[PDB]
Design a protein around this nucleic acid. Structure first.
Ligand SMILES: [Mg+2]
Ligand SMILES: [Mg+2]
Length: 1209
RNA sequence: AAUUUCUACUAAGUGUAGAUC
């Protein structure tokens, strides 16, 4: 009988690496320099990039051994089934499986033969690179035994040969890029054949381009395989584009000839598309500038492609609107906005057309119907200009409005060129430095942006076809030009990364000290081989590295008593008992030293001790006892570890025994070694010594330590059985300094420094010593990464999701933490009990820190506000944008802690937005990409949640962290449920009356006067109430469309309260309700004491009554009201009364402590996100224990409104 | 404006609060 969290400790193992600074002690650094130990590791760091290029060389020769040798069998059917003019009906589906097998055939041809094995293993730079193609053999030699360097590279490069359908894959480049273009050129070649003079075709082209083959050949389908390799690609593209001839001659390609057939001026005869060949900036101001000048000046090719695209689109009318497509996705919203004037128009017209087909007059639109229709829209690949014009009202030519938009964008590039013109002068020199030159950086960004946006907008004109009749006459010119234009993407990114860079560098290189096996392990004596160990003196820890000539130097050292002793590390990790107990104890040396029995041998060889229905408990137990006894009689192990074994009988399986061996097969304590003696070893350079350090080891550190500091100390604390452990794979790095100390910004001693937190009541600080910006980057820095194992031997095994459900099922009053992102609040929190009562509500705009019993807050929302003003003053430059992103990422590391306390405090489950059902809205300040990061870190922390201020052995302290979450997988996997975390859709959580569950499901925009009458008439009643001085609209959501989700159906709307209206004016004004009705009715001669006035109201003859009656109605249903300037109120008022008679205003809760209902609209959202989890909990309470794992949690809008409206009481 | 590293700091004077492969 305890808390639900109590059950979640020692569940699964987790591994982490702690980093530290390593401070060289004494003469160590001098010795390191004299003996020149470092430079070995530093040049390798230099030539790493060089060797990588040589690896790419052999890779490219390889790719071209497999590609010369390949004949695609799948191909010949594929081409046919491709240009079959589809005819669809999923007959094409047959083909889309033929496609995948084209990539399948390529991948397997790589893997299948001519080696491929020896490619990403140690033997590629050992021997293979040396035998392939002196100044290059030398660099590779030379990395022998240091093959570690290329592992990240090795992973990045094996993705080349997959069937992955990624732009990484060679196969994808072959079939889904080159082959569609190769096919599309056949059909161009067939159509455009006779244009070619015999003297033009094979004459100049066959001889000068080849003298082998003929031009006809490369437009035959069986010839494609020839064009997989780069030569055949160059040959092909030279046929199209042209060729230099090796003399000045310059042979025209096919495209020039088609061009020269402008003589018929009908023209618009399609040109061929070239084939994709396959397989920046950033180091200096002079480089960055050289690229900008070179790629973006007015006779660059990017600027050439812009002029061609200007010419192309100027003739947009000349082309067939039926054969021009716009890719489906964001480009559809945008172009809808630019063409018609609204986002959802295209989507809306398309929904109007889908309905008519799928909407049976039995009707009632349901959630699934809307989900399925949505799945259909998304699935649609693209829209022709013709189809878009099909939605085009009269008066509005879609092509022409598009022309004026595109042309406009090119004119904006040309004006921006004019403003940047001096930058492209041969004469131009950079006076200041780039990161000191805001003006230049802004000139560059302006131009880059205007071209990037042009590029990014024009990209929409494909539709990934895979499409029927395309206007190849348009897509010839377009594709020629756009492939060039696209180069701006790379340039943009590189230049931006360079400006955005920190003024310092974190570049570093791994240290082996001329030792391939340096520091592989710790725990055991292999210390003569690994040559690194760990020393302790008082509170300080040290890393000690023995010189090769003196490995044993640490061996022989007295226990002293001259009053000076480092403590010295030893003892032992027994690694993987399950592999290692049988490898030792069945080794013939042991099978001599011991007998053993043949009953034991037979059990092992057959494996009657494992699982898998050959299991025999007694056979298993015999093995155990054999091992147990073998353990008594094996010195190496029984003088190392203190084995305390469970009775053999209470072992159910063999893993039970193995865990105990693993658990006890690790010791760790300390030896004793003369301080004076090793200190001298350092002096003589027999030993190199570094202090392992972070600021928490400073003699002036008095605060609560870093979490990782605790982990590290706890490694060697008596109270740690239980358990954090030290692991091998430690690495030492060198980080060369990147700032010069004399050049740092400094706050000089004895002068007040302004304090920056406006909520810090102390205004200045005066210290008696100097404070330096970024000081740590002005010194060469050694850094030490040490791997640790947490909960290596878990006792509690179970499924975390199932256990959470079971405990919630049997919890009589489970609390839920709701988190929501808000408009006036970065994050807002609502804690709720098992019945929906709010227990705690507040904004997380302010993070309050504790040190002593002193509290100081930081308002991160004001920070973001000052930085957004900064971004405005700086004209949205890159660096402010990065500053805002990082601020937010900082903020979320603060929030993670606030959530952990709340979980611990209320034993509560967490309710979070599912971001894969993504909506989002411009007003919320934490965007999706930051929130996703937040949700990942929340998960990461809940793998091992720890409160730093708890005593470490206590549950929830550093040796007993809560594990209430499984390991992160991906963002797509952040849905449904991860342990204590539940992912909820935000649908209908903010705009809903938390006291009745009323949500506005009507559509109140004026459309027509008939529609308005129908609307008014669909109401049950409209009656002015004299007693309560109110108008009462009584409705039945049945008589209105798309209201299926509502549960109560019958709702009496009233007037009381007022509302804030946009009133887009000469954009804010406010409006009292029940007095706006009185006004309007008087205005039109309608006496309203006469109710039911529905019939009456419909007697009105002009739009003006109706247009303003509807606008009035919309406001009554507008529950959320906000001024935007004033932080005071973003309130919620509801047009419907509860069972006790008065209705809900937010301002009546707006100032209290933790009210019973939400205080503003931000709260309501976090409150309702939490209630959906209560709903989910409610489903658990309905299921049997063994069914819990199966219960669905994806609440539907209909379940939600039923719950919101019935549970309130 | 100090950091294993990050963000926000100065937090009582070479650092503070979270977080951190
Ligand atoms: Mg600290
Ligand atoms: Mg900083």
């Amino acid at each position: 009988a305890a808390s639900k969290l109590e059950k979640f400790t020692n569940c699964y193992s987790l591994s982490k690496t702690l980093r530290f600074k390593a401070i060289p002690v004494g003469k160590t650094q001098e010795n390191i320099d004299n003996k020149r130990l470092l430079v070995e590791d530093e040049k390798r760091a230099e030539d790493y990039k060089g060797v990588k290029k040589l690896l790419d060389r052999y890779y490219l020769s390889f790719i071209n051994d497999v590609l010369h040798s390949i004949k695609l069998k799948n191909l010949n059917n594929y081409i046919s089934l491709f240009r079959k003019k589809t005819r669809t009906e999923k007959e094409n589906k047959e083909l889309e499986n033929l496609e995948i097998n084209l990539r399948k055939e390529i991948a397997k041809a790589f893997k299948g033969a001519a080696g491929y094995k020896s490619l990403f293993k140690k033997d590629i730079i050992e021997t293979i690179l040396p035998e392939a193609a002196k100044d290059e053999i030398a660099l590779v030699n030379s990395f022998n035994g240091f093959t570690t360097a290329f592992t990240g590279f090795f992973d990045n490069r094996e993705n080349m040969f997959s069937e992955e359908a990624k732009s990484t894959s060679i196969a994808f480049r072959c079939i889904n890029e080159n082959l569609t273009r190769y096919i599309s050129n056949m059909d161009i070649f067939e159509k455009v054949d006779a244009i070619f003079d015999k003297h033009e075709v094979q004459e100049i082209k066959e001889k000068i381009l080849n003298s082998d083959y003929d031009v006809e050949d490369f437009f035959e389908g069986e010839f494609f395989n020839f064009v997989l390799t780069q030569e055949g690609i160059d040959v092909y593209n030279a046929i199209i584009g042209g060729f230099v001839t090796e003399s000045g001659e310059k042979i025209k390609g096919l495209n020039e000839y088609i061009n020269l057939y402008n003589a018929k001026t009908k023209q618009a005869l399609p040109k061929f598309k070239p084939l994709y060949k396959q397989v920046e900036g950033y180091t200096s101001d002079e480089e960055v500038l050289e690229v900008f000048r070179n790629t973006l000046n007015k006779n660059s090719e990017i600027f050439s492609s812009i002029k061609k695209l200007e010419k192309l689109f100027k003739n947009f009318d000349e082309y067939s609107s039926a054969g021009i497509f716009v890719k489906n996705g964001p480009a559809i919203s945008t172009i809808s906005k630019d063409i018609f004037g609204e986002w959802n128009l295209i989507r809306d017209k398309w929904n109007a057309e889908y309905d008519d087909i799928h909407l049976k007059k039995k009707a009632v639109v349901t959630e699934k119907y809307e989900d399925d229709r949505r799945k259909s829209f998304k699935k649609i690949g693209s829209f022709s200009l013709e189809q878009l014009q099909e939605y085009a009202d009269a008066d509005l030519s879609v092509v022409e409005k598009l022309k004026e938009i595109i042309i406009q964008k090119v004119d904006e590039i040309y004006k921006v060129y004019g403003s940047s013109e001096k930058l492209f002068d041969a004469d131009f020199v950079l006076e200041k430095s780039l990161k000191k030159n805001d003006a230049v950086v802004a000139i560059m960004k302006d131009l880059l942006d205007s071209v990037k946006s042009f590029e990014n907008y024009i990209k929409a004109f494909f539709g990934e076809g895979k499409e029927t009749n395309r206007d190849e006459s348009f897509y010839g010119d377009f594709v020629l030009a756009y492939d060039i234009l696209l180069k701006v993407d790379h340039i943009y990114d590189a230049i931006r990364n360079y400006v955005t860079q920190k003024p310092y560098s974190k570049d570093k290189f791994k240290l082996y000290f001329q030792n391939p096996q340096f520091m592989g392990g710790w725990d055991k004596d292999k210390e003569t081989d690994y040559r690194a160990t760990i020393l302790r003196y008082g509170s300080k820890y040290y890393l000690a590295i023995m010189d090769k000539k003196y490995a044993k130097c640490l061996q022989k050292i007295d226990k002293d008593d001259v009053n000076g002793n480092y403590e010295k590390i030893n003892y032992k990790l027994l690694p993987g008992p399950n592999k290692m107990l049988p490898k030792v104890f069945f080794s013939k040396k042991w099978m001599a030293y011991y007998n053993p029995s043949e009953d034991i041998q037979k059990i092992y060889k057959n494996g009657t001790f494992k699982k898998g229905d050959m299991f025999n408990l007694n056979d298993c137990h015999k093995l155990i006892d054999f091992f147990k006894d073998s353990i008594s009689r094996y010195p190496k192990w029984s003088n190392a570890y203190d084995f305390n074994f469970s009775e053999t009988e209470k072992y159910k399986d063999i893993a039970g025994f193995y865990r105990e061996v693993e658990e006890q097969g690790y010791k760790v304590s300390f030896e004793s070694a003369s301080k004076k003696e090793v200190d001298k070893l350092v002096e003589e350079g027999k030993l190199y010594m570094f202090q392992i350090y972070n600021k928490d080891f400073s003699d002036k550190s008095h605060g609560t330590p870093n979490l990782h500091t605790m982990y590290f100390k706890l490694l060697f604390d008596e109270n740690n059985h239980g358990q954090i452990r030290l692991s091998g794979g430690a690495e030492l790095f060198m980080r060369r300094a990147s700032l010069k100390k004399e050049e740092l910004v400094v706050h000089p001693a004895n002068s007040p420094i302004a304090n920056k937190n406006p909520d810090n009541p102390k205004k200045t600080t005066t210290l008696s010593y100097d404070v330096y910006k970024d000081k740590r980057f002005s010194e060469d820095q050694y850094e030490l990464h040490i791997p640790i194992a947490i909960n290596k031997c878990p006792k509690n095994i179970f499924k975390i999701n199932t256990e959470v459900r079971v405990l919630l099922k049997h919890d009589d009053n489970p609390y839920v933490i709701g988190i929501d992102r808000g408009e006036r609040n970065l994050l807002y929190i609502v804690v709720v009990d098992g019945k929906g009562n709010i227990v705690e509500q507040y904004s997380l705009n302010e993070i309050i820190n504790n040190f002593n019993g002193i509290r100081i807050k930081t308002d991160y929302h004001s920070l973001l506000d000052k930085k957004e003003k900064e971004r405005f003053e700086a004209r949205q430059n890159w660096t402010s944008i990065e500053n805002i992103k990082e601020l937010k990422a900082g903020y979320i590391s603060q929030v993670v802690h606030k959530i952990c306390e709340l979980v611990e405090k209320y034993d509560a489950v967490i309710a979070l937005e599912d971001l894969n059902s993504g909506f989002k809205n411009s007003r919320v300040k934490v965007e999706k990409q930051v929130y996703q990061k937040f949700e990942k870190m929340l998960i990461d922390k809940l793998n091992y949640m720890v409160d730093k201020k708890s005593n470490p052995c206590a549950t929830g302290g550093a040796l007993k962290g809560y594990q209430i979450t499984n390991k992160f997988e991906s963002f797509k996997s952040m849905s449904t449920q991860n342990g204590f975390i539940f992912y909820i859709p935000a649908w209908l959580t903010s705009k809903i009356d938390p006291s009745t569950g009323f949500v506005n499901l009507l559509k109140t925009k004026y459309t027509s006067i008939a529609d308005s009458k129908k609307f008014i008439s669909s109401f049950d009643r409209i009656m002015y109430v004299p007693e309560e001085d109110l108008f009462e609209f009584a409705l039945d959501y049945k008589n209105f469309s798309r209201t299926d989700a509502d549960y109560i159906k019958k709702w009496k709307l009233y007037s009381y309260g007022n509302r804030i209206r946009i009133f887009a004016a000469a954009a804010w004004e406010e409006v009292c309700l029940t007095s706006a009705y009185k006004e309007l009715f008087n205005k039109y001669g309608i006496n309203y004491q006469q109710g039911d006035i529905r019939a009456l109201l419909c007697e009105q003859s002009d739009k003006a009554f109706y247009s303003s009656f509807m606008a009035l109605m919309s406001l009554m249903l507008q529950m959320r009201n906000s001024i935007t300037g004033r932080t005071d109120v973003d309130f919620l008022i509801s047009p419907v009364k509860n069972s006790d008679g008065i209705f809900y205003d937010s301002r009546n809760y707006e100032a209290q402590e933790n009210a019973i209902l939400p205080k503003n609209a931000d709260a309501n959202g976090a409150y309702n996100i939490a209630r959906k989890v209560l709903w989910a909990i409610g489903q658990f309470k309905k299921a049997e224990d063994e069914k819990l794992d199966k219960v669905k949690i994806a609440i539907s809008n209909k379940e939600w409104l039923e719950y919101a409206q019935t549970s309130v009481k």
